[model samples]
Target: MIDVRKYIDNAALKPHLSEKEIEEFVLKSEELGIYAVCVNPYHVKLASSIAKKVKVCCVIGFPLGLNKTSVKVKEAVEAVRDGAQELDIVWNLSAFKSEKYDFVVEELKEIFRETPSAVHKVIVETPYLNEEEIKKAVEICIEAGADFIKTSTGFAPRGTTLEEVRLIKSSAKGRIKVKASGGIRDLETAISMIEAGADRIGTSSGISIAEEFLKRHLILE
Candidate 1:
């Protein structure tokens, strides 16, 4: 059986999750032996201290993606200094919508340049974009040296779809990783995303999904 834990990035990005809850969640995710535990920048230090077996990931520019380039860079650097191993930085859709592609590239380049060692996943939020837009965004992300192109912040009008994941996977062409996130709640959907070529699964429902995977694996045995 394939190990689902390695691909699972157990996310705790909900704004309402208490610090204590996040601490417990991080500890539990580490125990589950997942790929990483994703959190907001404020919790990076705590999660980092608690997670020994898993990498600590934090969001930059968060769900809005509207922070100034320098601010985002500062947040990214601070999170890394606090022990964040990876960063899910939001793509500036406002700039993209304004056709300010140059600004978008510059911002991403600035962030990545400042945090060269951290794994960078630029969230493209596919629900707001068409296929061409998505493809173009992928190109820009690759040009800016992003390590991964993630689908959503889970704050879009809707979660990422299978077609969206497939489009990103194909557009990426193995040049970078693809992370399928947002509303992926079940083991089946997570598995489907993986089959569609997602390199990572980012979800708040990782525990339930992992449990279901183990349940099936046990039954198969």
Candidate 2:
């Protein structure tokens, strides 16, 4: 099955939808069978309650990874207690780029140690990285114990490009799954990413994007 994950940024949701409106979105997503729905800790309980029918993911130190390791771990634990089935943690790129691999690894290790053994996808903001940097980030994640290595948090100038996704998949080499987020706006792009080795597609336009794909071809079996 195609695993298309949708990210609902709390800040973005506030400007566009009310509490009721947001619930409606969640219900619709559940009905459509979107693979996963991600939200911030503030809405973890709400998202989780709705996600009993869908996989609910929560962000840890979202968009930025400057938070202390202890704080991030506590956040993940709390989210899990509130019913989060997966965690999308942001990697500290500054530390990684500065060659503080130990610090990055330790931080991730702490989260891995504390988080539930469900699923953890580390977000390595790729726009701020070069090819070597991306390679190093993926390597550290695998070494540090991440289940998945994700592309972006969707706040950067660029998101998931096919080249970056392929690079991560190649670097991981089955050690970890790859998630492509940020720029996936339609079915063609989403399918392309999945075909290129993205195990999960993170996009805000997931339902329509999937429906678009189904419309173009009636080969569902």
Candidate 3:
């Protein structure tokens, strides 16, 4: 079974998550055997404190990918130092749309070079791009050495769709893993995406969706 990774409840770095709540949430995820827990940079240290028991992930550029490459590289370095095992970075879709492939590629390559040990998943924000753009974006990420190509940031109007997932899978062609994020709130959709070609499932409903998958008499267990 594919493990479910949870992106915590913080929206914009906000009041910041308390240590007590973060501990409790980590414990719960451990209990369910959930794969990992993701939070913003502000909480990376706290999350990492508990990550020895569960995988820890941090998002770079977050819901928006407008940050400069230097900023993202520093964020990635800090995240790794804070014990983040995985890093999810958003690609600059505006740059990609402008057909600045070389710029995008260099940005990602810099991050990869700086954070050699962390698992890096590049968020392409599929909802904002057309089919052609998506194809090109995936190609650039693959060429740039991303470990995985992810669908959305979940802040978009729509998340991962079957067509988008298939397109990514076909475009990537095993050169990199495909991660489906955003709108996966239940078992059926999750299963469909995995079957289509997603290697990892990123969502907040991981516990619920996993439980639902277990409920079925089918062999998903």
Whole-model lDDT per candidate = 0.90, 0.78, 0.78
TM-score of 1: 0.97
In terms of TM-score, the best-performing candidate is: 1
Q: Compared with the true structure, what per-residue lDDT tens digits does model 2 show for residues 1-221?
A: 35343422221233355667657767777776677777777777887777556787888888788888889989989988888888899977778878899999998888878875659889989988889988888888899888889888888887779999899999889999898888888877887888888888888786687566555545654
lDDT tens digits by residue: candidate 3, 34-113: 67776788788877786556688889988799999889999999999998888999988788878798999999999989
- For each candidate in turn, the TM-score is 0.97, 0.90, 0.88
Q: Candidate 3 at 136: error in angstroms? A: 0.3
CA RMSD of all predictions: 1.0, 3.0, 3.3
Superposed by TM-score, candidate 2 places the C-alpha of residue 146 at a distance from the truth, in angstroms, of: 0.8
Clashes of 1: 0
> After superposing candidate 2, which stretches have Cα over 4 Å from the reference?
1-17, 217-221
Look at candidate 2 and give me any clashing residue pairs.
Answer: none
lDDT of 1 by residue, 6-85 (tens): 89989998889999999999887776677899999999999988788899999999989998888999999999999999
Winner on TM-score (1 vs 3): 1
lDDT of 1 at 62: 94
